[PDB]
Amino acid sequence: ARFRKVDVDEYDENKFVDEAGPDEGEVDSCLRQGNMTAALQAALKNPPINTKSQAVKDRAGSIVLKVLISFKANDIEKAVQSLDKNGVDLLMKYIYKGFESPSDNSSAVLLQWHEKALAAGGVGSIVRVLTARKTV
Template identity: 55%
Template sequence: MAKNTSSSAFRKIDVDQYNEDNYLEEDQGELQSPSVGPDEAEVTAMLNQGRNIEALKTVLKNAPLGSKQQAVKDAALNLTLKVLLSIKSSQIEEAVNALDRDFVDVLMKYVYRGFEFPSEGSSGHLLLWHEKAYAVGGVGSIVRVLTDSKRV
């Protein structure tokens, strides 16, 4: 026999919160203070001393992901490409293996952004970076880069 439920507590649930049309994108960049990008003098000094992998880590750590200023992002891109192109082909695998997963994702963002604005001889070198970063990050890294709303 059916049970009599005279309770109306179920009517207090807001079912509209589960509607897919009410999706609000979370802007996590606003929660963090926007980065001003890597310090060019510090990175250039590292490159001059031959500490290329440390320069790469510094550039990736200080990437202006939360910044909305295109000039800051362009300056960071130019500096990152300078670092990437200064590392020899034989050292690329060692450099990528020294990075953690988040840094590999940021590296992939810069590689794809570098493909957008190729310079003399940069495309072949960026393809090597992509190959080694893909070996470490896998398809997941590419998917995270292509679906992330924070651009470099």
Template identity: 50%
Template sequence: MAKNTGASKFRKVNVDEYDEENFQDNEDADVGVVGPNENEVSNFLNQSKNVEALKAVLQNPPQGCKDKRLKDKVVQVVVRVLSAFKTSDIEKGVNALDSQSLDTLMKYIYRGFEFPSEGSSATLLSWHEKVYAKGGSGCIIRVLTDRKTL
């Protein structure tokens, strides 16, 4: 038989705090300059410096931004940069990136599939293959489990 201890501390827990419907994400509120510099990226592409354009477009991703139009615009710029590479030069571009940039690139690749255009899916699949070869499964897992979306 259970003893009546008179303990009532458990009654002071606010169970609504753990409700999934009331979840509030605490994203970073310090959003300064967001997104890559399009002029700089365009200059690199015009000069056929594709690797530098790739690095420039991955420098400042709009992860904390809530403006969907800005994020969509940045994804289109990234897809434009990825499409500028020849298939034989993709591996050289991937090898020039560090692991954090690879994760960001993988996020852009997945977001690029949301905006299919003529030949973009084939290009994105080629990039996905090369990024996976360098970054491994961990790159994909980090992208899929990250709460900060692009």
């Protein structure tokens, strides 16, 4: 009957419960001034990992994405290699988020970045993308 339409599990008490962005100007400046590797680092700075706003997350994503597009193919490696592991990890999460919004040909470049991030972070950096409870 009618009492089965309500998912009592919804209010179950045992059920598990999980526990701003980069400096726009900082980034554009490194870009404008040609400091590519510095721009990547600035963009990977302070991720929205703790805000419930898909909006701010999207801005962070766009900022990071912008940088990744600016890069000249032959420069991607050198830049990625400048990052520490926590950095490569974060970069990987941003690369996966990019994958969710193909534009012009942004995906072609995101795949090259993925090649590099993978090379520096290993398959384990991808793992940590899937394992994250708080993400970009």
